[PDB]
Amino acid sequence: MVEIFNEIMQRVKEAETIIIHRHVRPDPDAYGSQLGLKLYLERKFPEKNIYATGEAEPSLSFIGDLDEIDDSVYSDALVIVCDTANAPRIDDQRYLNGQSLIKIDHHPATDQYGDVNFVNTEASSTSEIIFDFISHFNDLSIIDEHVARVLYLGIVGDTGRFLFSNTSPHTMEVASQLLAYPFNHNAELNKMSEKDPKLMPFQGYVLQNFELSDSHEYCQIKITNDVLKQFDIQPNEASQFVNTVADISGLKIWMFGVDEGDQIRCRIRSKGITINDVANQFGGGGHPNASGVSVYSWDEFEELAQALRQKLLEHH
Amino acid sequence: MVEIFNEIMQRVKEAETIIIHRHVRPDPDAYGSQLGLKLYLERKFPEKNIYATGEAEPSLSFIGDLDEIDDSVYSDALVIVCDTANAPRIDDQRYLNGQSLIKIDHHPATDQYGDVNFVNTEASSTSEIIFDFISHFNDLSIIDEHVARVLYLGIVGDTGRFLFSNTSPHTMEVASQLLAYPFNHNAELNKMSEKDPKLMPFQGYVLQNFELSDSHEYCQIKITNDVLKQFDIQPNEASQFVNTVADISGLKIWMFGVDEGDQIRCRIRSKGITINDVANQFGGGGHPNASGVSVYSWDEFEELAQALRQKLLEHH
Ligand SMILES: [Mg+2]
Ligand SMILES: [Mg+2]
Numbered sequence A, B: 001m002v003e004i005f006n007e008i009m010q011r012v013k014e015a016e017t018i019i020i021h022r023h024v025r026p027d028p029d030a031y032g033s034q035l036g037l038k039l040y041l042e043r044k045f046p047e048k049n050i051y052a053t054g055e056a057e058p059s060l061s062f063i064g065d066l067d068e069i070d071d072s073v074y075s076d077a078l079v080i081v082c083d084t085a086n087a088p089r090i091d092d093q094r095y096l097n098g099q100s101l102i103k104i105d106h107h108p109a110t111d112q113y114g115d116v117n118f119v120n121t122e123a124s125s126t127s128e129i130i131f132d133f134i135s136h137f138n139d140l141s142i143i144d145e146h147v148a149r150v151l152y153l154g155i156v157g158d159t160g161r162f163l164f165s166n167t168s169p170h171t172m173e174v175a176s177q178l179l180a181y182p183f184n185h186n187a188e189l190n191k192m193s194e195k196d197p198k199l200m201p202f203q204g205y206v207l208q209n210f211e212l213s214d215s216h217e218y219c220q221i222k223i224t225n226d227v228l229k230q231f232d233i234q235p236n237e238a239s240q241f242v243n244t245v246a247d248i249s250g251l252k253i254w255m256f257g258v259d260e261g262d263q264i265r266c267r268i269r270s271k272g273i274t275i276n277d278v279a280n281q282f283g284g285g286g287h288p289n290a291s292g293v294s295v296y297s298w299d300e301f302e303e304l305a306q307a308l309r310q311k312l313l314e315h316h
Helices: A004-013 A028-044 A126-135 A145-158 A169-179 A183-192 A197-208 A224-232 A275-283 A296-310 B004-013 B027-044 B126-135 B143-158 B168-180 B185-193 B197-208 B225-230 B276-281 B298-311
Strands: A017-021 A049-052 A076-082 A101-105 A116-119 A218-223 A253-259 A264-270 A285-287 A290-295 B017-021 B049-054 B078-082 B103-104 B116-119 B217-224 B252-260 B264-270 B284-288 B290-295
Touching: A004 A101, A004 A126, A017 A145, A028 A049, A028 A076, A028 A126, A028 A145, A076 A296, A101 A126, A126 A145, A126 A169, A126 A290, A145 A169, A145 A183, A169 B168, A197 B197, A218 A275, A218 A296, A224 A253, A253 A296, A264 A296, A275 A285, A290 A296, B004 B103, B004 B126, B017 B027, B027 B049, B027 B078, B027 B126, B027 B143, B103 B126, B126 B168, B143 B168, B143 B185, B168 B252, B217 B298, B225 B252, B252 B298, B264 B298, B276 B284, B276 B290, B276 B298, B284 B298, B290 B298
Parallel strands: A017 A049, A017 A076, A076 A101, A101 A116, A218 A253, B017 B049, B017 B078, B078 B103, B103 B116, B217 B252
Antiparallel strands: A253 A264, A264 A290, A285 A290, B252 B264, B264 B290, B284 B290
16 A cells, blocks of 8 residues: 555454554653554444553653553454664563554654554654544544543653654644643643652752853763762762753753763763764764763763863864 | 724724834743734835834844834824733833824733724733734735744743643644744744853752742742852842742742842742732732732741641642
8 A cells, every 4th residue: 555544544443452562761752652542542443452561651650551461462463563763672572472563653764663664754753643643534523632631742742842843833733733622731741840859959969060161062060979979869860960951051062971880871962963973982872962971980071071072163 | 893903904004104012021922922013014014114112121132123213203103012911011101102002912901002902812922913913814925934933932932832821722723833934943942941051050059948848739948148149149130040949749839039138029929829819918919820028037938938838728
């Protein structure tokens, strides 16, 4: 065929039970897109058995709970790996133990795992692809407040509340359409934006210990083992406050290094400049806009700063 | 008539020069709605003279600059007080010195100043009303990247990036339509989200000095004159960090009190509970969700806390 959506819905109508998967570390989209496809199907073919397997992140518990698959249901069922770049990165690994495999994602097509592959690279999120799918079957009536909830939240998180560049006029329109359904976005949004007061004091530290260039283009934060225990926080926890300096006016590149003990795992992100470049120089790597390195000392951490800062000289 | 939009466009076509106004303390909407109506008109009747008067807030300088009216142009011209609850709160006061007055706003109609009054109470923002207006004249083609810019930014700020409850599915749709025009929202958005690193250290203090109830429902911050000079910041500046604790999980009501010297001007905001109530008890007042009081001591500040906290006992 040429209209993959139809071939999917077909494979679906011909299976009494289908289970959906998503990548490992879950995000609002990976959550909404999964629970969404599910909630949708369950509304269209109540005679079938739709399940969503996953580790279940308590962080997204409010979006919806997952299902406990008995691994023997994979016998004669259709597996749908929703939102997942590469297969190994799929959550439950018994997905390949189904009748046929079908994947829906919005990341660059490099794996193409699964029989039928539909990747709308230009989509803001998989949730969005799901809305497109159900919208292609005029089921915008069969859907309700429960389904739209996840789909919204999904698009919301994957685009940071329609802020990121991946937000298109269509994305808005879809968001527009979901809000039609009664569910109160303001509420849902807040419960998603909640924060732990426990970590707030530390975050204040980050704000009190900067490191901006005279030009404001470069900014760093050294989290010494001392502060890690002074504020009583694990190296992991503190490492989530990277973008706590991103909003500084004029900031072009910033690095956040927290000492784990025998190495200083530093996460480096830039406004929009090839950075993973220098990352490799130090044995690191990653996306050109958000890479990571694991120096063995602050003296080396500084060499990284010097290398990063020099990158700003080529641009002006 | 019954279709105010037409009566406006009429009064417009019959005036070689029209000037637009907005309320005093400007906001992104009041800015976008003004510059927007203007930029629009200037595209429709280049033969006329459209001007936008205002004090000009350097904060919104990037949205667009205002015009310097010679007060004698008001001779035979149409004045359009865009986005402004009450007349006294209008910026340039020589507005009443025009041929006829016409106002467009989205706040409750309590003033009704001006000949023709159009208030879409259910609109997310005046900018949105402007899009509606131009959209009613099929001028979505005459408009360009420059006009949509302000209108977007306007809706954006007035709804905090489609987060507030005033965000409707139509609001999204309008946002959707504006993005069609080439202007890059991501960029524009950031320049609007920029922050001053100068105040960041202090903000860290606020995060390091909370005051949450055992239930997390109540939170306060006492900004003593000491810290006001320890971090070298004016009482005004520090007072803008009220909602710096709003995202705490479970927070229902919070107060932020900063000592100005001979009085402690405290701004009190709640999640969604009638609060201006207690405000009056202390000689204050304001909206039920964001009021203000000016106690003469921290001992009194505490009485306010007690009164506010007791308000949480009636609800559960
Ligand atoms: Mg995704
Ligand atoms: Mg407004």
